Design a protein around this nucleic acid. Structure first.
Ligand SMILES: *O[C@H]1CCO[C@@H]1COP(=O)(O)O
Ligand code: NI
Length: 291
DNA sequence: CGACGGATCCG
DNA sequence: GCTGATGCGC
DNA sequence: CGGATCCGTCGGGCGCATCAGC
């Protein structure tokens, strides 16, 4: 059973088709084409993902042979890094772990690479949400965006504080070299990125305030949503809530993105989703960027 | 988080 | 010290 | 009027830190 190949939407369109990674993906590049492969996955507790499947990271390298793996919601403490650092995967010696010191066992991002970055820096310019990694031709920012929560308590903090600082961080990097922004942006951009847009108008993640900041602070600053631009009018989800068993019915959201600067957006070859990989409420997404 | 009614618009 | 029960915020 | 909004409230599943009880 492949529920992601079936189109589930409350207000769909005739031109829309459900994402099928078997058929809707292009084939890999010729052996030797200078490129870089990046994967992103919200693990919803990395210690819980490994208790479920120990080889979750290895089975990604076996299926895609990525160069860089970006993670969100690792829910790791600063003391838990070294033990995970040795038992997650081999051959990726450059792993950087930003953990949350405010709330313990909460949030937490990571960037695990096999190519040595020129420089890595957490935060802008506490909850482990920003990891900027410099490379020979581009920055790579792995981001886990905070949620407004029940009652939209942090909605003003999300719009006037987080989305503004995140945008200014990305543009200051573009002054040097282009940007590949990945991670859990925690926002369903358009109505095609959610199965029930009408029923979540006031729900955190699909509020109009968050959706306008998705365009203003991010896309309208010279950026492209690779998956949407590669597959215009194609429904694909990267999240399914446990509360309603949404993964068995494909009733989900698209919260994980690969936003790439206009400079190198043409060099994007594939922006895919792997909805068959279980172990978390999210599923991994990938990017194949030509160099 | 999304499901499910009651109650407000509203053209 | 180890296992289960509890309360939290996605 | 009556379909299309808005909105009040619950039932709900999970990874973590924490906590007492054995
Ligand atoms: O249920 C979704 C809608 C808004 O945020 C949650 C996703 O939570 P994350 O696990 O992406 O932080
Ligand atoms: Ni989550």
């Amino acid at each position: 059973s492949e529920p992601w190949t079936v189109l589930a939407h409350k207000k769909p369109q005739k031109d829309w088709k459900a994402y099928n990674p078997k058929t809707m993906r292009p084939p890999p590049l010729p052996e030797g084409t200078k490129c870089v492969k990046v994967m992103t996955w919200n693990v919803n507790g990395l210690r819980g993902l490994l208790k479920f499947e120990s080889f979750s990271a290895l089975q990604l390298a076996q299926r895609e042979n990525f160069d860089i793996l970006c993670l969100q919601e690792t829910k790791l403490q600063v003391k838990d890094v070294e033990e995970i650092k040795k038992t997650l995967i081999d051959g990726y010696d450059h792993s950087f772990w930003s953990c949350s010191v405010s709330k313990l066992g909460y949030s937490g991002t990571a960037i695990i690479s096999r190519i040595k970055p020129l420089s890595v820096r957490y935060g802008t310019g506490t909850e482990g949400r920003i990891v900027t990694a410099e490379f020979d031709s581009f920055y790579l920012i792995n981001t886990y965006v905070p949620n407004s929560g029940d009652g939209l308590k942090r909605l003003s903090y999300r719009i006037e504080e987080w989305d503004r600082t995140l945008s200014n961080h990305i543009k200051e990097l573009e002054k040097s070299k282009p940007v590949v922004l990945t991670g859990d942006l925690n926002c369903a951009h358009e109505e095609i990125d959610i199965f029930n847009p009408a029923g979540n108008k006031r729900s955190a993640g699909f509020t109009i305030e968050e959706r306008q900041s998705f365009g203003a602070n991010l896309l309208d600053k010279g950026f492209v949503d690779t998956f949407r631009k590669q597959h215009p009018g194609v429904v694909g989800y990267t999240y399914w809530g446990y509360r309603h068993g949404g993964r068995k019915t494909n009733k989900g959201w698209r919260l994980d993105y690969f936003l790439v600067s206009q400079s190198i957006a043409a060099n994007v070859h594939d922006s895919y989703i792997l909805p068959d990989i279980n172990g978390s409420d999210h599923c991994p997404i990938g990017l194949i960027l030509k160099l």
